[PDB]
Amino acid sequence: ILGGREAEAHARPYMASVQLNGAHLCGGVLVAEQWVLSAAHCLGKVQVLLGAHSLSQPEPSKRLYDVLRAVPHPDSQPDTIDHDLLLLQLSEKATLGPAVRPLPWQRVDRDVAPGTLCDVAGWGIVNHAGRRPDSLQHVLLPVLDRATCNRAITERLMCAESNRRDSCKGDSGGPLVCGGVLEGVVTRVCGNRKKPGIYTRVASYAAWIDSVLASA
Ligand SMILES: NCc1cccc(Nc2n[nH]c3ncnc(Nc4cccc(O)c4)c23)c1
């Protein structure tokens, strides 16, 4: 996250670090006891760290989970920006507590009103030099209407302003949360107002997400 602040420890209990060979790779969001939503482009040994604030310091809620299954969206492809969702099934149901709690997601397929303030969090890089934070960062960003944002922004995507405050490398797959509801997933440039952050609209994929979770 560029232009943000250290988050209050465990105030976003849905927040997940998707890890590759023991290191933070991507953000993710806990959406059921056994399921984490992230970005297909993120995907070697894949695990998910729940209940974390700091990557390095002991916390009673920190737990690392193995991934039984990785389910990219059928239409996802390495070339395109479209359909960039990934569902990760954990090795077991996560232990829920004050610091680990699924986030409900939007299933009514309608845009977030432009100008709405949404919260984006992650352990992605905090400056253009690639400095990686130890602790979770966040920032509030206003939604940008699709017309202004537009060529490439389809009805399955949405934009948020990137004027100094922005998501960046390592924040991919993390949640865009508007009024306590998951609305987007972070999917490029950072901190440049001319290139808004692009986010996948979870409501466009409601049927696919239900269908995968319903295979329990
Ligand atoms: N702001 C939208 C957004 C969302 C998610 C990820 C991203 N960026 C990136 N995703 N992957 C990346 N691999 C390498 N570099 C990247 N950006 C970068 C790195 C150093 C300096 C700088 O100004 C920008 C990114 C950007």
Q: Residue 137 has which token pair? A: 């960062």
Q: Could you tell me how far CA 125 lies from the centroid of its own chain?
A: 14
Q: Domain spanning 13-102+204-216: which superfamily? A: Trypsin-like serine proteases (2.40.10.10)
Positive or negative, the CA dihedral 38, 132, 102, 5 is: negative
Query: Are 17 and 27 in contact, with CB atoms under 8 Å apart?
Result: yes
Q: Is 19 in the pocket of ligand 1 (CB under 6 A)?
A: no
**Closest residue CA from atom 14 of ligand 1:** 169
Q: Do domains 1-12+103-203 and 13-102+204-216 have the same CATH topology?
A: yes
The residues annotated as belonging to the active site are: 41, 84, 172
Query: If you measure from the C-alpha of residue 201 to the centroid of ligand 1, how many angstroms do you get, rounded to a whole number?
Result: 19
Please state, in angstroms and as integers, the Cα–Cα distance from residue 15 to each residue in 9, 29, 141, following that order: 11, 5, 17
Angle ∠(165,185,214) on CA atoms, nearest 5: 160
Q: What is the DSSP letter of 210?
A: H
CA distance 198 to 177: 14
Token pair belonging to 38 = 């992230």
The helix or strand, by DSSP H or E, that contains position 175, with its residue range, turns out to be: strand 175-178
The rounded Å distance from CA 168 to ligand 1 centre is: 4
Cβ of 171 closer than 6 Å to ligand 1, yes or no, is: yes
Architecture of domain 1-12+103-203: Beta Barrel (2.40)
Ligand 1 probe mutation, 118, 161, 188, most atoms within 8 A of CB: 188
Q: Can you say how many angstroms the Cα of residue 62 is from the centroid of all Cα atoms in its chain?
A: 18
Q: How many CA atoms lie within 13 A of 113 on its CB side?
A: 4
Domain boundaries, the chain: 1-12+103-203, 13-102+204-216
Per the CB < 8 A criterion, the answer to whether 170 and 126 are in contact is no
CA of 130 to the centre of ligand 1 (A): 9
Q: Which atom of ligand 1 is nearest to the CA of 198?
A: 2
Q: How far is it, in rounded angstroms, from Cα 37 to Cα 22?
A: 19
DSSP lists the bridge partners of residue 105 as 182
Q: Around Cβ 34, how many Cβ atoms within 10 Å?
A: 19
Long-range CB contact pairs, 186-189, < 8 A, 24+: 186/27, 186/39, 186/120, 186/122, 187/39, 187/41, 187/81, 187/84, 187/157, 189/162
CA distance between the termini of the chain: 34
Residue type, 161: E
Query: 193: CA distance to ligand 1 center in Å?
Result: 14
